[PDB]
Design a protein around this ligand. Structure first.
Ligand SMILES: Cc1ccccc1CNC(=O)[C@H]1N(C(=O)[C@@H](O)[C@H](Cc2ccccc2)NC(=O)c2cccc(O)c2C)CSC1(C)C
Length: 327
């Protein structure tokens, strides 16, 4: 279908960006499509933070569809906070264009050390309205609306590394991406793309958790409590300075990660969470799991899942589809 296709391109590590232009002159920007935030921002030219130094900056004169706002405002992401001011210009996603409301970022340092360390300029959120600061209607909701796409949904198709290329699709399920039949889960709320699921990490488990599907992060997380029990099981090693738990890859005895719907069951093998350390030899591994304390029953599923499962987000259907991806 007229299904806009956005190419996610990954970068040495394992995080992906996508092209993004704002305005008549079509200034280009490496963003981050994220189902965890619900805003959009681009480091504005009127920024001078070191961060911005080596970064694509947005400049407004240059266009004339730039409508002015200047209302000052900020966002406090999990790993930092940003400051600037709303602006409204033309935001375009390859095939599709659109006049939208975004934040012109001025003061970063903070998202910092991060912000420079990462091959990215901005973030385009893909969450629900209530998750956004300033109550802004999720683009996809608001293309569907202007009837410029079939329906309100987006798909995240994820591959691997050397292998191939990520693919964000807006407006339709493309079977070119998955294997088997799709199963869905209905959102427990319209904030994040959160759904109710029963969760086992191998042996240690938690029932009726709140799980959410975060295209933005590259990790999988869970309440620390829940981890401790798990980590201790397979004797993991947390070296202070390094921020990841390491462990033997060939671990005779390798648990999978269970995610149970009433009548669906989603699993994640040990290979979809682990990474050699060290790139010469597969003795030690780095895990993609980390203890974070959002709530007491809140988990987060980032790339690691979507690498395996082609995922579908349906605004109207007020739900999310799951299915195994093509390779
Ligand atoms: C997984 C995790 C947990 C806690 C802190 C950081 C991270 C890693 N975050 C990431 O990889 C990236 N982000 C993401 O993946 C985002 O989806 C982030 C995920 C999240 C959800 C609930 C609690 C805390 C964080 N969410 C938010 O930042 C967030 C969530 C709710 C409201 C809101 O105004 C924001 C900005 C935000 S930018 C980022 C590059 C930091």
């Amino acid at each position: 279908s007229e299904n806009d296709v956005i190419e996610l391109d990954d970068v040495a590590n394992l995080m992906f960006y996508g092209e993004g232009e704002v305005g008549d002159n079509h200034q280009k920007f490496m963003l981050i499509f994220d189902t965890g935030s619900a805003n959009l921002w681009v480091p504005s030219k009127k920024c001078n933070s070191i961060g911005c130094s080596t970064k694509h900056l947005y400049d407004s004169s240059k266009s004339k569809s730039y409508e002015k706002d200047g209302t000052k405002v900020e966002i406090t992401y999990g790993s930092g906070t940003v400051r600037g001011f709303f602006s409204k210009d033309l935001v375009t996603l390859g095939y599709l264009s659109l006049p939208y409301k975004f934040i012109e970022v001025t003061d970063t340092d903070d998202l910092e050390p991060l912000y420079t360390a990462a091959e990215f300029d901005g973030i385009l959120g893909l969450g629900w309205k209530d998750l956004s600061i300033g109550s802004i209607d999720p683009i996809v909701v608001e293309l569907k609306n202007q009837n410029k796409i079939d329906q309100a949904l987006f798909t995240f198709y994820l591959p691997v590394h050397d292998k191939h290329s990520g693919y964000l699709t807006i407006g339709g399920i493309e079977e070119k991406f998955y294997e088997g039949e799709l199963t869905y889960e209905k959102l427990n709320h319209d904030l994040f793309w959160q759904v109710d699921l029963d969760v086992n990490f191998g042996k240690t488990s938690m029932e009726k958790a709140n799980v959410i599907v975060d295209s933005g992060t590259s990790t999988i997380t869970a309440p620390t409590s829940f981890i401790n029990k798990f980590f201790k099981d397979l004797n993991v090693i947390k070296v202070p300075f390094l921020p990841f738990y390491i462990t033997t890859c060939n671990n005779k005895d390798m648990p999978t990660l269970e995610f149970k719907s009433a009548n669906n069951t989603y699993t994640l093998e040990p290979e979809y969470y682990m990474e050699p350390l060290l790139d010469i030899d597969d003795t030690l591994c780095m895990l993609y799991i980390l203890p974070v304390d959002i709530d007491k029953n809140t988990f987060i599923l980032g790339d690691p899942f979507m690498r395996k499962y082609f995922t579908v987000f349906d605004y109207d259907k007020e739900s999310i589809g799951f299915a195994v991806a093509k390779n």
